[PDB]
């Protein structure tokens, strides 16, 4: 049973674990499960204990510090590439991407690069342009429809008012007798 931070016991408690909790991955959304976890206090009754070296001494443990393994993936986001190579805004990102050689037997030695995300590109400029363009038609559409309806409302009231004034003029005259 794994250890869980914050339990504060030398033994094993059962907790109602949800999403984001350690020692548990839900099989479907909103699922909770009760699982047995061991507290954060280290005792003798442990099978394996995990240690993370924060400070390195003068000596050298074989295996641990003899060699260094590289990061398996280069940055993808454009800002991440810029941050890695401390590039300024007015610089190109395409040439400064990490390219990973591929050296499997049989197939000739090719190279692969990640697709940079979050980068201004001719498409992003257009897509932003098309968004602004749709804002225009909508503003133009509003104006025309409100303009056209202004005429029709004006004309209809004129017809209604004239008839309303026409019949009252008729009733007033016949009321003279």
């Amino acid at each position: 049973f794994p250890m869980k931070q914050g339990v504060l016991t030398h033994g094993r408690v059962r907790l109602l674990l949800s999403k984001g909790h350690s020692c548990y991955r839900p099989r479907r959304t909103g699922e909770r499960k009760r699982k047995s976890v061991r507290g954060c206090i280290v005792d003798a009754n442990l099978s394996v204990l995990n240690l993370v070296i924060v400070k390195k001494g003068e000596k050298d443990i074989p295996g641990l510090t003899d060699t260094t393994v590289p990061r398996r993936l280069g940055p993808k986001r454009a800002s991440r590439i810029r941050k890695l190579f401390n590039l300024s805004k007015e610089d190109d990102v395409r040439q400064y991407v990490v390219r990973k050689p591929l050296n499997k037997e049989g197939k000739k030695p090719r190279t692969k690069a990640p697709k940079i995300q979050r980068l201004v590109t001719p498409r992003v400029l257009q897509h932003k342009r098309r968004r602004i363009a749709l804002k225009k038609q909508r503003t133009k559409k509003n104006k025309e429809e409100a303009a056209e309806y202004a005429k029709l409302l004006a004309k209809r009231m004129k017809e209604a008012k004239e008839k309303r004034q026409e019949q009252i003029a008729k009733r007033r005259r016949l009321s003279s007798l």
Binding site: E145, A146, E148, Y149, L152, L153, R156
Partner: protein, 262 residues
Amino acid sequence: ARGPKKHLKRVAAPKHWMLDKLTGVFAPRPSTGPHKLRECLPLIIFLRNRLKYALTGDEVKKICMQRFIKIDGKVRTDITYPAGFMDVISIDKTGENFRLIYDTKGRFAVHRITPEEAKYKLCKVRKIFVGTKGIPHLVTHDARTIRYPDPLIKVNDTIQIDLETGKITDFIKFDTGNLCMVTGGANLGRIGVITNRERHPGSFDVVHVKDANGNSFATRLSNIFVIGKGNKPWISLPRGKGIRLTIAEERDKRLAAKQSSG
């Protein structure tokens, strides 16, 4: 149940679809769209059962996925799209341009209209309200809210809309003497002229319709759909001009057709 139903049993399907019994257990559940589940015709029903363009359901979607079927001028690719009454179905690959109009008995007929007629449709006015900052709004029988309508248009009126611009061209008021077609009830599919409209406060108002041949009937105001101005219709009438006939006159016509042919 615990939520909306997604199936429709074949025998529970609306009888007007004229679906049979031994084909299968289910009928195409009308995917939600502008009309009502019971007052619509799914595209697969129209394309397969009526026109026989496709023999199976999978061939129906082969047509729809090729972006051929157009409804109200818009390419609709959902095989269970609810087409509904007074809608234009355009197949440019063959220039068909059907319109869905109830026949005499109350079903959707395969009524073909010219491409010139396929540029418009007629819509009953369901609701009139002023929205946002005083802007009038007109709702339609097919739920097409239309902004800034002509102030003379009221409820129960019929408006003519262009399929391209989606804008009202001209309307028909709801008054006695206009030509109407019944869109629900026993007298479904009949075409006549309004003669009277009695109204009960807090009750369904009753309207009286006189046929071309003099057959007087009545129905609820909800089923009344004006399709023309005074006597003249604004749309092509169906194969039978909304004349109910009687089982005896059907036999006479059927017998006359057989013996005249041979």
